[PDB]
Amino acid sequence: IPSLAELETIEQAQYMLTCLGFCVGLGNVWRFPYLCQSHGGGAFMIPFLILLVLLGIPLLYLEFAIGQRLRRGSLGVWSSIHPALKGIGLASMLTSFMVGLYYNTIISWIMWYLFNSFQEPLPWSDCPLNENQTGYVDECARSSPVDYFWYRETLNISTSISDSGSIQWWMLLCLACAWSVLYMCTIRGIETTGKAVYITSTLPYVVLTIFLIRGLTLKGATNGIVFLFTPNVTELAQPDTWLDAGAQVFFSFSLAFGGLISFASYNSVHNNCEKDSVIVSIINGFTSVYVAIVVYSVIGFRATQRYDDCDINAFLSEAVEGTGLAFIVFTEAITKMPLSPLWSVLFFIMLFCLGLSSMFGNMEGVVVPLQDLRVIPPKWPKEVLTGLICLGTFLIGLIFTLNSGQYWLSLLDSYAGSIPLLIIAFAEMFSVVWVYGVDRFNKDIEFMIGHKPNIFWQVTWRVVSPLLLLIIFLFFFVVEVSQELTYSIWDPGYEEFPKSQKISYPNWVYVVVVIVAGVPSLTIPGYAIYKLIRNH
Numbered sequence: 247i248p249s250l251a252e253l254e255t256i257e258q259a260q261y262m263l264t265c266l267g268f269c270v271g272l273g274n275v276w277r278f279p280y281l282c283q284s285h286g287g288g289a290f291m292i293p294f295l296i297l298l299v300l301l302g303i304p305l306l307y308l309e310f311a312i313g314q315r316l317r318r319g320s321l322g323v324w325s326s327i328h329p330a331l332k333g334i335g336l337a338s339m340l341t342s343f344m345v346g347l348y349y350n351t352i353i354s355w356i357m358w359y360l361f362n363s364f365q366e367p368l369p370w371s372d373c374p375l376n377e378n379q380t381g382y383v384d385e386c387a388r389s390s391p392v393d394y395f396w397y398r399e400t401l402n403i404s405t406s407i408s409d410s411g412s413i414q415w416w417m418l419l420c421l422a423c424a425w426s427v428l429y430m431c432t433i434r435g436i437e438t439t440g441k442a443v444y445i446t447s448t449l450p451y452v453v454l455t456i457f458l459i460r461g462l463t464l465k466g467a468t469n470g471i472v473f474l475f476t477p478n479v480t481e482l483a484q485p486d487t488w489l490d491a492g493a494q495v496f497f498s499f500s501l502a503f504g505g506l507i508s509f510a511s512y513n514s515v516h517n518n519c520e521k522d523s524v525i526v527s528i529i530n531g532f533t534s535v536y537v538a539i540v541v542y543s544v545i546g547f548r549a550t551q552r553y554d555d556c557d558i559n560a561f562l563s564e565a566v567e568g569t570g571l572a573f574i575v576f577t578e579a580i581t582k583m584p585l586s587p588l589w590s591v592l593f594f595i596m597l598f599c600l601g602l603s604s605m606f607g608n609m610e611g612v613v614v615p616l617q618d619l620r621v622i623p624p625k626w627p628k629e630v631l632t633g634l635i636c637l638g639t640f641l642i643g644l645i646f647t648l649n650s651g652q653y654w655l656s657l658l659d660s661y662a663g664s665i666p667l668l669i670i671a672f673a674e675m676f677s678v679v680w681v682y683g684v685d686r687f688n689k690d691i692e693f694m695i696g697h698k699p700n701i702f703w704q705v706t707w708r709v710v711s712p713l714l715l716l717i718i719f720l721f722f723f724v725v726e727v728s729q730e731l732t733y734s735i736w737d738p739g740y741e742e743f744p745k746s747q748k749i750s751y752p753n754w755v756y757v758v759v760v761i762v763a764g765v766p767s768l769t770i771p772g773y774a775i776y777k778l779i780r781n782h
C-alpha cells in the first residue's frame with residue numbers, strides 16, 4: 247500500500263450525473279418492486295429502509311473510502327490489506343458473472359417489448375380471439391391480457407421447472423442482440439457510455455414522473471400506495487423478509503460487487519467520499535421508493551377494479567406476483583395513455599438504456615478482475631477475454647430461453663443475488679476494521695477528508711453493521727432448514743387459475759443453490775486456507 251505521503255506526491259453538474267449512474271439500474275426498477283409484493287409492501291419497504299441506513303450507507307462509505315485510499319481495483323484492494331484475502335475479489339467476480347447471466351435475459355425481454363411497441367393497437371391492449379373468432383382466449387379472459395402477453399405470448403411459460411419444452415427463438419434473437427450489443431459496447435461502447443450516461447442516468451426520472459402523474463390519477467392508486475406502507479407485523483417478523491431486504495440494498499447500491507471500489511480507485515486522493523456515499527445512497531433509495539410508488543399506484547388501480555367487480559387487501563396481494571411484475575404493471579399503465587405506442591417506446595427505450603448501462607458495468611466486474619488475474623496470454627487483447635466471457639454467459643443464458651426459463655431466473659435471482667453478497671459485505675467490513683485496522687482507516691480518511699468519521703460511522707462499521715449481517719446470516723440458516731423450498735407456477739388449467747400455485751422445487755434444485763450461492767460464498771474461505779497452508 248502507498249504511504250499517505252506517496253499519495254499527495256503521486257497526485258501531481260458532472261458530479262451529479264456520475265452520481266446519478268449509481269442511483270438507477272434494473273435492480274431499482276425491475277427487482278425492488280417484485281421483492282416488495284413478495285412480502286406485502288410495508289413488511290418489505292420498512293425493513294429495506296431500516297437496513298439501507300444501517301448497512302447500505304456505512305458499507306457504501308467503507309467501499310468508496312477504501313478504493314480512494316489504496317488506488318487499486320477490488321481484486322488488488324483485498325490482496326493488499328492481507329494476501330490471504332484475495333478470495334473477496336474472486337467471490338466478487340463470480341457473483342458478478344452469476345448476475346450478468348440473468349441480467350441479460352431481463353434486457354432480452356426489455357427489447358422484445360420495445361420490438362412489439364410499434365403498433366397503434368399494442369398487442370397487450372386486449373384479448374386475442376380463438377381460431378373461429380367465437381370469443382376471447384380462455385386463459386386471457388380468466389387472467390389479464392397484459393398477464394396473457396407476458397405469460398403466454400412472450401414467455402410461453404410451462405407449469406413446472408421440470409417441464410422445459412423448447413427454446414423461445416424470439417427471446418433468443420433479442421438475447422443475441424442484447425449480448426451482441428453488450429460485446430459491441432465492451433469493445434468500444436465503454437468510452438461512449440462515459441459520454442452517454444449524461445442521458446441514460448436522467449431519462450429514467452423523466453419517464454417515471456409521467457407514469458407517476460398517470461398512476462396517481464388512476465382510481466384506487468391510494469389503495470396501492472397505503473398497502474406499500476402498512477406493515478403486516480407477522481410478515482415483518484419473518485426471518486426471510488429481513489434476509490431479502492438485506493440483499494436488495496447491496497443489489498441496488500451495487501455493493502459487494504467490486505465496481506464502486508474500482509470507481510473510487512480513480513478519484514482524487516482528497517475527494518470527499520463521505521459526501522459521495524451519502525448523496526448516492528439517498529438518491530438510490532429515493533429512486534427505489536419512487537419506482538415502488540409508481541408500480542403500487544397501478545397495482546392499487548388493478549386490485550381496486552376487482553374489489554369493484556366484487557377485501558382490497560386480498561386483491562392487492564393477488565394482483566401481480568412474480569419476476570414479470572414490472573413488465574405486467576408498467577405495460578398495464580402504458581395501455582391507459584393517449585397515443586400509447588409513443589409512451590411504450592419511450593418507456594422501453596429508457597429501460598433498455600438503463601439495462602445496457604447496468605449490464606456493461608457488471609461485465610467490467612468480471613473482465614477487469616480476470617485481466618488482473620493474468621490468467622490469459624497477455625497477447626490476447628481484452629476483446630478475446632470479453633468475447634469469450636460474453637459467449638460463455640450467452641450459452642448458459644439459453645436456459646432462460648426455455649419455456650421454463652422464468653422459473654430458472656427466479657431460482658438463480660433468489661440465491662445468486664442474496665447470501666453471496668451478504669458474505670462478501672461482512673468479509674469486506676471485517677477485513678477493513680480488524681485486518682487493515684479501523685484506527686489506520688480513520689487516520690487515512692482524516693488525511694483525504696480533513697476530519698475523522700463521526701460516531702455514527704464508528705458504531706456502524708464496528709458493531710451495528712457487522713452484527714446485523716451476522717443475525718441476517720443466521721436467519722438464512724433458520725429459513726433454509728425451517729421452510730421447504732416452494733415456487734409459484736403459471737398453470738392456466740388449475741382451480742382459481744389466476745391465483746398462485748406454490749409447488750415444491752425438485753431435489754436437484756439444491757445442487758443449483760450449492761453452485762450459485764455456495765461457490766462464491768466459499769471462494770473467500772477456500773482461498774484463505776490455500777494461501778495459509780501454502781504459507782507453510
Ligand SMILES: *[C@@H]1O[C@H](CO)[C@@H](O[C@@H]2O[C@H](CO)[C@@H](O)[C@H](O)[C@H]2NC(C)=O)[C@H](O)[C@H]1NC(C)=O
Nearest residue numbers: 285286289477478479480481482483484559563
Ligand atoms: C400477514 O402475514 C402473514 C405472514 O406471512 C400471513 O400468514 C401466512 O398465511 C399463509 C396463508 O394461509 C400461510 O401459508 C403462511 O404460513 C402464513 N405465514 C405466517 C408466518 O403466518 C398472513 O396471511 C398475512 N395477512 C394478514 C393477517 O395481514
